[PDB]
Design a protein around this ligand. Sequence first.
Ligand SMILES: *Cc1c(COP(=O)(O)O)cnc(C)c1O
Ligand SMILES: *Cc1c(COP(=O)(O)O)cnc(C)c1O
Ligand SMILES: *Cc1c(COP(=O)(O)O)cnc(C)c1O
Lengths: 441, 439, 424
Amino acid sequence: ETLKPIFGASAERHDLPKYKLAKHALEPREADRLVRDQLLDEGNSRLNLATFCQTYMEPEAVELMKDTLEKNAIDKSEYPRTAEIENRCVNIIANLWHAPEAESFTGTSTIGSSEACMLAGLAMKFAWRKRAKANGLDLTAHQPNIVISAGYQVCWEKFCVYWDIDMHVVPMDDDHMSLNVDHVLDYVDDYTIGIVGIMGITYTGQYDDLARLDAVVERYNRTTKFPVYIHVDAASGGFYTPFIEPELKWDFRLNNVISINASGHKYGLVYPGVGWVIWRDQQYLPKELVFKVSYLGGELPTMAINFSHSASQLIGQYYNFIRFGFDGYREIQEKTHDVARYLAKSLTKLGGFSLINDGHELPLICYELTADSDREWTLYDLSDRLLMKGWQVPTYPLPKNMTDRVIQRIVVRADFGMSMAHDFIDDLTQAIHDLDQAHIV
Amino acid sequence: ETLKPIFGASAERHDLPKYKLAKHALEPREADRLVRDQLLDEGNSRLNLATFCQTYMEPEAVELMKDTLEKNAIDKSEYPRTAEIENRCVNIIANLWHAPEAESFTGTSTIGSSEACMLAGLAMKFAWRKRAKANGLDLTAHQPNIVISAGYQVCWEKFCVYWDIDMHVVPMDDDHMSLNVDHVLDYVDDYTIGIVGIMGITYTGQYDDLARLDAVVERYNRTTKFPVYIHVDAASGGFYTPFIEPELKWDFRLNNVISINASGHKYGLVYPGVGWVIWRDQQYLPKELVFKVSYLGGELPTMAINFSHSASQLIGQYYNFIRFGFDGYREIQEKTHDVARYLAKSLTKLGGFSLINDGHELPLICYELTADSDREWTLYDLSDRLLMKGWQVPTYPLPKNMTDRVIQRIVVRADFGMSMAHDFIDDLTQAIHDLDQAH
Amino acid sequence: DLPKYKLAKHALEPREADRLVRDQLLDEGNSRLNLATFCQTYMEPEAVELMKDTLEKNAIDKSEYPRTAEIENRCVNIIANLWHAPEAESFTGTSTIGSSEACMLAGLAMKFAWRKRAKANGLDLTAHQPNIVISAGYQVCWEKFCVYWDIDMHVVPMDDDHMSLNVDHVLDYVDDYTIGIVGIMGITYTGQYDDLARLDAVVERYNRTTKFPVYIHVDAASGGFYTPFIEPELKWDFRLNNVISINASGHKYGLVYPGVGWVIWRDQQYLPKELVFKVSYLGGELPTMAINFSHSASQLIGQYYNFIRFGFDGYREIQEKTHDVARYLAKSLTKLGGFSLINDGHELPLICYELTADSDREWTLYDLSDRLLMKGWQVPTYPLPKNMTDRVIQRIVVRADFGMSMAHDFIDDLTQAIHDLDQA
Ligand SMILES: *Cc1c(COP(=O)(O)O)cnc(C)c1O
Ligand SMILES: *Cc1c(COP(=O)(O)O)cnc(C)c1O
Ligand SMILES: *Cc1c(COP(=O)(O)O)cnc(C)c1O
């Protein structure tokens, strides 16, 4: 049985189970080799330039994550030490976002910013509904709505479809590639549950002007009995911007920012599987959304869509916090910023590229092809050629009012080093040369 | 700085950050030691008997999970091999649950059964809503409802709160530690989006009689233009019952079971982080819950609440499928069954216990203390002593119409060996003795 | 950046140096998805760890590693017997780095043996160089042998009816100056076997009528560790009387990572004594034939590991599996249509093909290589050897670690690439 060579065994002579469980078990070495082999031919994650999600952690953190895979992040009474870590993380992030000590912030780890955005939105919906009932607003006339920029990530569309919320979408244009705050009051009405500000737009790399939105909202709220507050989607900005622009006011320093989310597995430096949501004060969380759990043979409040899941990633987040601290994070984000700027400068130096975003805010570059009548090929062709050399660079359309603009994004993470970025620009230069003399589509 | 002994260094003279980041970085070996040390003082997971969640996997699966932590399960176009493995697990699981060849099943991995239950309940709500509109029901008069046993896991209560559904709860009693199928139609009306049958109840370890419920539903549905269908919450049973009672009809063999969820991290044998939901046919999934993702420069359908997350657990699930196959899963679940039955027999031989559930169905044992005015201690005191001897055994009240009944539960998972269970019973014997003479 | 011209002045941290080298290595192909080479891209975990643990051993150093030397001699014995070295005669052999060095050493034995014959017969050595006769699908090492040692290459061209040595005409290239004929048991470009049994009979007839006889060297770089396990009845080896020496690459179908080959002589008389350098091991002195001096013993020890671990049945199971994958691929390409198979994997597990004539097809095999590379597979395009240099082919070489599940994935990738190309 183990006498069989791994690549002489019966299982290596047949296809893998695709529709049903095979009758018999296999040796651990055989199953292992077959599963790993199915995975060989997908992009090496380090060359995936299409994602915010982290593709490197230090070996110590990898080993640590491995050793805590059995831990169950929901089970506070059985894993009270993991639950303490989570609490420390929430405190740490709250302080990073200037949660005021005069109010009692609450928050939680989530699987990612999607779960967090949905919880935040649900908190807004439920708080809005109590206001609406008390002011005799007719709940059958219209659906509640939220106001958000057209750069929204798909989780906000899921939130709206799943919970019967209209989306009041503030479109982008050539000058407003972030929320047009000057016009935001045109989308607000009695049924508005809140306004989402995006601190790092997935499509463009740009910050919404949260400080200006906060000023407008402060003034709007004196004029109505249907006040409206800000949720910040800082999926990506939340772990980046405090270390490189600490004086930019986007967070709980703004009076009307009531909740904030971020993904640990974006610029929090953790592999996929953790996000974070924080409410400035226990009142911006309606009690009917809080399910209470056993802890210290007593009680703790929880806001959660998921139940059981791995604590590995939240532990990893604490490992990062302790390991890097403020200065370590800052050094990492600064080098990331620097590679993004080298890249934006390299693409203008090559010509044929017009930069939509040059990496001044998030470390992300967006560009389109400058129109040239003597070019058969599109960015789709460029993405194909770059795959030949390992690189994944996605091509996509901009969101509404710029759906005629086709772009490519490069997102730069902590493990995209300066040397690898010089290599990328070589590979990219050769691709442009190869496509300039191509004879097929 | 790298010369310092780990326990001679400045970071071990100071407390860890609790309220804010420290300013300065630490060396990797020091950070690693400090985080692991914070974790020493929780109960070794293998001795946690309150939970269905897996606390062991074989070393080859551990290493494969480690090696795949950077993969992002949502990102199909960048990890198409991982997405193909996912599709293969949906097929495998659909087949295991007898999805009919004549219809076209769909499904997806989830983080767990919570997200699965919620996506199923939402499919039911949206499909109910179209049917209700088309029959002119007044949608303003009552919230939609769902019907379920009182032993529902908290994720159904969350589903109901979050989506404004009324829960019509069928109570338990002394003779019905699972759904009272004969009474279920008292709870159904035109507003009912569906009935949830639980294939392995968290509190009691018992199967809802899904076959009987299907026959009740089939009869009810011929008399009405508001038909009702069954969603099976098989969080636990989905990966247990197919291997030990393959003939028990609970799954898509029943005509009116339109969807089923199971937790891969329960009897599917994966560490926490993977669940599964399957629909018997595409028509039971409303198109407006499907958000589309690029793949091979085309389009692929997804139902999902979460977005980015680890692929490690789902690859682990496929590893288990390949490594164990049907017979391996069967041998594991059989051993697990054997241990549960050993624990049930040892509690009865000790005297002083009444078995509420004896582990014939899920491998779970439920018990209360028999009436006795001379005994001054409670099951809460027993939990506390068992904890001193290393074990976590929860004490809790039974659900509706038994909320005055206090019980203990022991769940038996794959990694509770017979050896270890003999040791548990010695420990339980000693703790009883200790409680009988303390104050 | 990393040093590209000069040494840096200062050392780096281990983790930093490690990270920098490994990152530089990132962006080259996962080796296992390269279908253009015979070189092994996988070994079992015990072998990898044994290799790592004997990295320090020196294969050349016999008095200092006598147990490693014994292992070499065992492998030589094992390989001799596999290729049916006769017991009536006295075979010798050695490990080498690869088939190149082995080919070179065998070619040099032939040159030196020819030159003595030639002097004895009064042949004018100044009038022509010695020559060797070989098929036009020769591997580059034969051309380096000829250039390095001043031997003319008498090349037998290939054509549509002969994708291996043309035995009908091989003697047209043979003359008094011929040091030998090389028969290739697995041609790199085409995967085909030269008809060794026929060449042997032809040579036996030739040799009966001249005092300048010619013998056969078999370049079994690939076939040597493959053909004995799936076609043991095929006579290609020392069962043929005029086969005097044979080479094979252990890092080809011998299943070892790069860095071992083997050369065996059927008898001591085919190895001129001037090529033998003797050494100090155990009580006496051991004969050596070797171009290289110090080098790793890891691959050698890897080969013995493989022989002990798998034995006959294990090698056979691996090679039969490999055979089945190759056959699966040939049948999958015929199912798709549009390909003309030059080799269909009945001989070596290599499939070789061209696109069938079609005027309404805008794309070529070069474009197909490109789309496969996008999908992660290296399947390059190249011209055939002399007389078919205008014919453009693609090749898939199947090795031990190309399992059947992986091959179904490859075929789905290939199917999709074709579709994409037909809309381009
Ligand atoms: C990616 C992203 C999300 C979703 O994040 P996950 O962590 O993948 O769930 C939400 N908002 C924004 C701005 C994002 O970039
Ligand atoms: C635990 C459980 C759930 C929740 O499962 P997770 O996988 O933890 O989300 C749902 N239903 C039942 C019956 C359960 O036992
Ligand atoms: C590759 C090859 C060689 C050279 O082999 P190495 O082991 O790389 O030195 C010689 N002959 C044939 C037939 C080959 O395929």
